[PDB]
From a paper:
Type 4 pili (T4P) are retractable surface appendages found on numerous bacteria and archaea that play essential roles in various microbial functions, including host colonization by pathogens. T4P are composed of thousands of copies of a major pilin protein arranged in a helical array. They are assembled and retracted by a complex machine composed of several essential proteins, including a dedicated extension ATPase, most often called PilB, that is essential for pilus biogenesis. Here, we report the cryo-electron microscopy (cryo-EM) structure of the BfpD ATPase from enteropathogenic Escherichia coli (EPEC) in the presence of either ADP or a mixture of ADP and AMP-PNP. Both structures, solved at 3 Å resolution, reveal the typical toroid shape of AAA+ ATPases and unambiguous 6-fold symmetry.
Purified BfpD was prepared under two nucleotide conditions: either in the presence of ADP (BfpD-ADP data set) or in the presence of ADP, ATP, and the nonhydrolysable ATP analog, AMP-PNP (termed BfpD-ANP data set) at a ratio of 2:4:5. Subsequent 3D reconstruction with C6 symmetry yielded resolutions of 3.1 Å, 3.0 Å, and 3.7 Å for BfpD-ADP, BfpD-ANP class-1 and BfpD-ANP class-2, respectively. For the BfpD-ANP data set, despite the addition of ADP, ATP, and AMP-PNP, the active site of all monomers was fully occupied by electron density consistent with AMP-PNP, suggesting that ultimately ANP occupied the active sites and remained there. The presence of ANP in the catalytic site results in an outward N2D movement, stabilized by interaction between Arg 217 and the γ-phosphate. BfpD-ANP class-1 has an outward N2D compared to BfpD-ANP class-2. Comparison of the BfpD-ADP and BfpD-ANP structures reveals a subtle outward shift in position of the N2D with respect to the CTD such that the mobile innermost N2D loops delineate a circle of 65 Å in diameter (distance between diagonally located Ala172 residues) in the presence of ADP, and 70–73 Å diameter in the presence of ANP class 1 and 2, respectively. The N2D moves toward the 6-fold axis in going from ANP class-2 to ANP-class-1, likely reflecting two successive steps on the way to ATP hydrolysis.
Numbering used by the authors:
A (entry chain A), B (entry chain F): 107 to 222, 231 to 298, 301 to 305, 311 to 534
Write the structure that this text describes.
Amino acid sequence: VEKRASMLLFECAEMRVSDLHIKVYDAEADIYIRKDGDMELLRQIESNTAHSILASLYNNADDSDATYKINAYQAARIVASKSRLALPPVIQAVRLQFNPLGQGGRYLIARFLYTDDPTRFGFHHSHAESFSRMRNLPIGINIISGPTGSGKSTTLKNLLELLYIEKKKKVNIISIEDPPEYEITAQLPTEAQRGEEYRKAITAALRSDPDIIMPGEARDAEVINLLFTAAMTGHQVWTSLHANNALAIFDRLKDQGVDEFKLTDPELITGLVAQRLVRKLCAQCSITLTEYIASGGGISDTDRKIISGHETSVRFPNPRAKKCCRDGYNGRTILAEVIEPDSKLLRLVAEGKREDAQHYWLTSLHGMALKEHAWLKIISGEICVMDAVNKISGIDNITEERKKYLFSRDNEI
Amino acid sequence: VEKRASMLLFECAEMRVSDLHIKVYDAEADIYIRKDGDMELLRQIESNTAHSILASLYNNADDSDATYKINAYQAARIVASKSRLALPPVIQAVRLQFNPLGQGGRYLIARFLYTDDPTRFGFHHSHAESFSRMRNLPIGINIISGPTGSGKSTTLKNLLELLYIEKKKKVNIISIEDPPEYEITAQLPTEAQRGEEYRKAITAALRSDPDIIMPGEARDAEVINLLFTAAMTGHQVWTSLHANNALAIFDRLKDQGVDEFKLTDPELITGLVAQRLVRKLCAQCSITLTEYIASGGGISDTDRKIISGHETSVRFPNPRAKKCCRDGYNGRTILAEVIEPDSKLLRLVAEGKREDAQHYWLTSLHGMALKEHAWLKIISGEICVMDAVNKISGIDNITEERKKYLFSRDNEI
Ligand SMILES: Nc1ncnc2c1ncn2[C@@H]1O[C@H](COP(=O)(O)OP(=O)(O)NP(=O)(O)O)[C@@H](O)[C@H]1O
Ligand SMILES: Nc1ncnc2c1ncn2[C@@H]1O[C@H](COP(=O)(O)OP(=O)(O)NP(=O)(O)O)[C@@H](O)[C@H]1O
Ligand SMILES: [Zn+2]
Ligand SMILES: [Zn+2]
């Protein structure tokens, strides 16, 4: 039924979920939504209605092979301005993935791409200073790394507005994003055809005077090679990648053929940012450790080790669903690490040491990693310890001297 | 005759054997079964009846070339829900391998794939702690290694239930197993076609949001490359491999093209497990060393060296087939080694030293190898020394200081 699918899509748009999952078990079908970073169960619908709405979603999808193919895997895309499903204006495009499940079952995954203050989202002040210093440099390449729900596009858009303000419209800015998402310059619009179109758009942007290229993501190795050659040509590149800890970026680049002599130059690789998104506790409804352990308190030994020393400072989510917010959580915040490479740091990284290179960054360069930022926001009470240790590993490995140094540097500023 | 083959399959299912071997010598045919880890002789059947039942098994098999091909090698598969042989519900699929044997003889091998408490199967407490620590980490790749009868699928299923309990259904779990074996998430279902289907299923699982990928085995190099790229993308992988001693995993990976820069990072390779299955003595019927040597005692010099120091503690199988159990053995237990890699350990392994790297793991990392666990279960009396030295080599090479340290660490806990 088209109507039930339309109501489901409107409900998911108004509730602002990220992904939608539908699992059919031939008795009852589970409908799950991905709100913020955690998954939750939406509904237990009937199997026949779920099969009907999945069939309708496949039929009104733009890509279809005229076979439902219960036993076979399928992919499809629904694009706005041509849709009999009467899509809401909030959702621009929906990417549907259909998978077989057991015997006569279906698994539908929907990505729900959306078509929709100047600074200090969740970053530290040192990260803001590094961002300003990186924006002041005319020549270089910047790479943003993290998992899928990092929010790299929002950071790139905010940096683009900051470049608008700072540069006084004296430079040319080009933006090459195949899916138009959010206001952002010249917005330049199967998988192989999309990749070929993206490569053609990048080449056409390079034929003109790009100054700042601002590419969208980096899937292919040829794309990254073209971006690197344009960066050594004399332009500025702000790209995004999938990596961890702001040092696996080099591992993700050497896998595709960037070669070691390009990554050694500190003038080329201007900055590296690795960020993650975690849920933020509501400020109106927060409880102390004693109030948390008073009613159903569950704390592990590592969590107790992290809290120890600042037991009164930490905060926990408040149950009972008070008037403010929804469930004691108010949005999300970014924990990030920003590195400005040096000659010695890049020389140590290129040798593949992986030891005394992170130490050099933390001690000599006065750098801060993602674990220290997560611990600082744990002590400040902005985020819960359980969410931080679920998202990030290694928080309990911070030494006492490092914690004392971080507290001293936070108090002296 | 279909009836005799049906009775043979029912007998093998009720007796719970692993593999079935039929050898034809044109005078009398040997029927052998693989119960637990050891092979034994089931029956001495007539050659004509064996040829007839093998011909019937080939004819009712799904794959057939309409030629019996006595002189040629053949392979076939029998799948449930489409079988004129009236398969028992316990057996899902049977893989038949037919080989020539001498002049006019046949060799049939049947794998007998079966379609069918929360922790502490045979693992040590340190292994359980390492398992919990590995389950707490959000990003990484875990590899389970061992011979064919290790029981890696059972360990992976138990870890999946433990992840169900721990994660509180806040993450998405996908399972990609081409043969559906045992309850386990979204269960995603010639050799080249099967490999292509497996690769397509893995790609389709990667197109959605996998979080935890949980792949089934690793046959091809492209599959392992895709798993590694997904692990550096930011997902978690629990895969199984065929290797020994938890350090030949790197040798099995470098053979297929993982490259050295991917294996150096300790944040990527989160843990390595190598396990084996040995027979456990029945607790009701156990005899001491004196009772064993009283009647038909056969002990070697190396076995005497291993037993020496704890002669009264060891136990031996009890003959005469008492009321309990079957032959003095009660099930099987796992002897395993679990390593959490470090930067120095991975640097030493990547250099190909093979010396002072195992020493670093045993001394600095306080690790325990499979030989020490086997010796500890020998001293505790859970398993027999002969089975342990048949399954595992190098038990007699443990020094006296290491044995004293193991006994002290077992007594202090
Ligand atoms: N402080 C915040 N910073 C960034 N994003 C936030 C923040 N708070 C909430 N969000 C939301 O987090 C969501 C993730 O942003 P998004 O740019 O879509 O991630 P992404 O890296 O582009 N995902 P993908 O393209 O699939 O790899 C955004 O839609 C934000 O609305
Ligand atoms: N403590 C135990 N732990 C694991 N398996 C056990 C144990 N006790 C008995 N078993 C049985 O050992 C058998 C081997 O398990 P299995 O998962 O089939 O090994 P495998 O590694 O998957 N073999 P293969 O796929 O051919 O490489 C299982 O069927 C168990 O029933
Ligand atoms: Zn609130
Ligand atoms: Zn017994």
